[PDB]
Design a protein around this nucleic acid. Sequence first.
RNA 1: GCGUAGAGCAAUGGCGCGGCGUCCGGCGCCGGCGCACCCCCAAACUGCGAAGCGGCAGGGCGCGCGCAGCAGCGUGCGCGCGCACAACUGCGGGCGCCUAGUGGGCCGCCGCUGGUAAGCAGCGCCGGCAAUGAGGACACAACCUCGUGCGCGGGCAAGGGACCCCAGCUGCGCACACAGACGAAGGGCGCGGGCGCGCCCGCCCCGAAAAUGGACGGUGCUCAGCGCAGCCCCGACCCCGCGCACGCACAGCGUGGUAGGAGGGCGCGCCGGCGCCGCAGAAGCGCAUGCGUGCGCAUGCGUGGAGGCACCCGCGGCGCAGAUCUUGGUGGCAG
Lengths: 63, 209, 160, 102, 169
Amino acid sequence: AKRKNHTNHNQNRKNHRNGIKKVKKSAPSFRGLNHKYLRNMLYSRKYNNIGRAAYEAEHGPQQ
Amino acid sequence: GRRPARCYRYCKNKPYPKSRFCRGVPDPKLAIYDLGRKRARVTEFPLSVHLVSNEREQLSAEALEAARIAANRYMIKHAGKDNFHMRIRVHPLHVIRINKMLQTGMRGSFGKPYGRVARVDFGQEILSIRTKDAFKAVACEALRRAKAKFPGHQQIKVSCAFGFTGISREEFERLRKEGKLISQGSHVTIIKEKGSIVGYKEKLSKAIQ
Amino acid sequence: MRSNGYRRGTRHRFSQAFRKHGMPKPSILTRVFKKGQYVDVVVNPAIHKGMPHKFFHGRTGKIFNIDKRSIGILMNKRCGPRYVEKMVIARVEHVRPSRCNEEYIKRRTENDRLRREAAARGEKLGSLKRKPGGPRGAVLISTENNTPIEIRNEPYFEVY
Amino acid sequence: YKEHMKKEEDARREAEARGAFYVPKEPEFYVVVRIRGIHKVPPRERKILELIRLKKPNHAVFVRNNAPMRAMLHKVRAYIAFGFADIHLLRTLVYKRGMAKV
Amino acid sequence: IKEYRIYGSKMPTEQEVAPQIFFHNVFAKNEIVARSRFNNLMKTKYKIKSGKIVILKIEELVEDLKDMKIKNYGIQLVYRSKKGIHNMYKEFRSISRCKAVEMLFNDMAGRHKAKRDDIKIVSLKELRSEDLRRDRVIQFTKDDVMYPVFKKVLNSKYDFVLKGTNIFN
RNA sequence: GCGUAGAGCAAUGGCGCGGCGUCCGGCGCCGGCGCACCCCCAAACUGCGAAGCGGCAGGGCGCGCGCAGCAGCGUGCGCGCGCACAACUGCGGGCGCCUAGUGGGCCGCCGCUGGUAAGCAGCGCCGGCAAUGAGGACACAACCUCGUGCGCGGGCAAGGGACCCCAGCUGCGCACACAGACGAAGGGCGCGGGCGCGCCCGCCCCGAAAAUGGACGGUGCUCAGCGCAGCCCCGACCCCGCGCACGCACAGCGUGGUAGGAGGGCGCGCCGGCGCCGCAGAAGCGCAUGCGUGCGCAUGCGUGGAGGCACCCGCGGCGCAGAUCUUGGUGGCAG
Ligand SMILES: [Mg+2]
Ligand SMILES: [Mg+2]
Ligand SMILES: [Mg+2]
Ligand SMILES: [Mg+2]
Ligand SMILES: [Mg+2]
Ligand SMILES: [Mg+2]
Ligand SMILES: [Mg+2]
Ligand SMILES: [Mg+2]
Ligand SMILES: [Mg+2]
Ligand SMILES: [Mg+2]
Ligand SMILES: [Mg+2]
Ligand SMILES: [Mg+2]
Ligand SMILES: [Mg+2]
Ligand SMILES: [Mg+2]
Ligand SMILES: [Mg+2]
Ligand SMILES: [Mg+2]
Ligand SMILES: [Mg+2]
Ligand SMILES: [Mg+2]
Ligand SMILES: [Mg+2]
Ligand SMILES: [Mg+2]
């Protein structure tokens, strides 16, 4: 039978009972980053305290 | 066959004019908005009396024609057909609807165009008559024959303005003597010092006096 | 009940201002953008590519990603009882560098400088809080050359 | 307290000894009494009465005479009676009904 | 009710060190209505709203009733009805200025249902007997006026008493 | 960031007359057209644009050194040293897991849509009822006050203070109509004020007609009506104070509750134990008394004539006012 279609009544009151929780803090993610930038940042992290020329002097051609 | 005007009295809906979305609305029976000697010059009818709405409501186009004829017949019979120019201010622009429903009831309820009304506010003039000063009492009487055709309360006001210009009679008389007025028929333009001066001298050339 | 296209109900939101139509000026290309910087998404409707959703047209978010022609922006949205972080990709024509923290950065760099300089001379400054508007001050208004003026209620007259 | 009040009266009568008008610095706090009850309060007004610690009617607090606190008092002014206490109203409120949050 | 002369001005800033001082003479119930009636007149005559007004002084204008004669008062007022806003001029005889406006308020309420807040007083002037315009208040300016009391008034609070007891006299 | 109220005809789209014309047509006039002023306008118009809202910021910074395949002269990321607690007010906060009920709503306020309207239908925001008692509304889911353990004392709220019915007196007005006590356009040498014979404001009158006899709640009231002022009073579970109960993380704070969830107990049949009782009278039953917030418990007396109780454990066909419940018995109807 024909009845009520829609309301937003009591929705703000419901949504504030457990509050509007924030975005939950996380570790920083590489999701959404530029791929050329992210590839280069990991290369800088891979050869952080030892340079690349010294790293490939040890481990050979690293690619 | 027409509904009583108590069904469409108040400004209930948003204004709903004849547009590309609302077509098929019939023409209003209020055909004439200017009566008497329309071609009379601005300086011939100093006096101005107005029928002013004390209501927020919708005047029917049928009542706007009935009050038109009631006021026009009185100004003709008493002031004469040359001694006045009566302007109907409000225009029946709002279209009222009728549902008219086998009997469908409230299914598909949005109504077809049924009539035209003019939407008036508190203090809005409905009619206005410009006359000579001798026909004040005639013009006050013709408007009270017009407001009988109207719903609710109306008030007849004698305005200190000169005719159908917004300028008051003392202020209109001064600028007419200064040469600062150019007639546009029922209303007037005040000559200012803003033009080019060759255009300003052509403006004084076309002044009233 | 309205249809749910990507630019629904944007007749005024995605319009141009009066006498401010046209393609964007090349001076926007000289704006720097950095990761962490806050930006205001305000859609240039002359630029049809990289347009964000209409929901983010008033919003301000922090940059997480910087691309060739575009910028990734973190913007929280209410989904019921939670804020959900949306990643908004927008062309630079649709963003402005936000002045949301404009007066905070001006306050911070000066105050951090003053704290560094005072620590250099062996002093220290206790607290550099912004003091709000307190009570009114005491006033002295002299009636010398300033005579008090009576205000009266006046009779109601009406002009018509 | 007497010396601070006597200094303001001496500042005020010296100003009217000349032509001047002297009003002192208005106090550093308002005293606020919750007048209306806890029912039918919209969520903004209910929140401000919580931050003023006015959780029942006939409860009274002191709030600071700040520009943010004056705007808070204005938004719930249909629920409160607020004004300026002098030193006698301040001391009567604390000595007669004064408890500590410990 | 009481009469207040309330002095106020714009709050002085660095741009305007001595603003123009204004004052209003208000017949009000207390100083809070008197501040309220002052703040509207600064808001509507000038454009100074109440957030930027400092009220410099509020004094109670009280008359000395040393020998306490009756004066005549002509009151020009503006009262708002349910239908409009109108001007009226009423004349009263009373003790003080603050008592004559109390006679104005009880009369506008009795005769026109005008509440106290619906009434703004343009001017209150103490008048001679020769300058009075109302013939009803003129009758009591004559010397040696006299009338009897025709209303019965009880001489105690009674519920039931015997018939012989005088109650009116 | 918005584009609503307002405002605007300036573009789009309408409305309407005049005015003007080295414009056109017809016979100086009339009609077209053009222009400028103007008029009435717009939910699906906007050169403007509020009130109101929305987003974000108010903390880390400064310096130095390493790294990169990115970049072409920066950007990120590592690391170190140094500096440092950032408007107001309030205050503990964050997150996870499992699961119920719910998914017919309704009402008020403000803002709306459709509709002649509707105790109609459909929305927005907030509040309520549902599930919220109590006081005031004559009674009355929603209005007003205002929340709500059990009492005592105070003070009040809304609302009132002729009698029902707790609580009223002092003054100033006004009104006469079985009025106050449903109402329109239009009226009234009705009365009271006010303004310039006409207006205006109050009260009253006419307009004002329904069917059981009857409803300001009633009685009634003509100072119990319509207005005002002053002082006072009455009045809730509100607020305050005290005491107790219960809950809490317990020098204190808190206390409504449907669907619903949780905890701790009461009660029943039997079990493994453990303390006992009974022909000097067990269970059951009837009537009393006591205890207990309560589920219930204990005793006395009577009856009864052989079993039973308490606690700890364990098992469960474990608690009834309802099901046109089932079975049995019995009434009223009805001599
Ligand atoms: Mg009919
Ligand atoms: Mg409608
Ligand atoms: Mg494309
Ligand atoms: Mg609009
Ligand atoms: Mg509008
Ligand atoms: Mg309904
Ligand atoms: Mg309640
Ligand atoms: Mg109730
Ligand atoms: Mg009741
Ligand atoms: Mg009392
Ligand atoms: Mg009594
Ligand atoms: Mg309580
Ligand atoms: Mg409970
Ligand atoms: Mg339950
Ligand atoms: Mg047993
Ligand atoms: Mg037992
Ligand atoms: Mg069973
Ligand atoms: Mg049974
Ligand atoms: Mg049951
Ligand atoms: Mg039978």
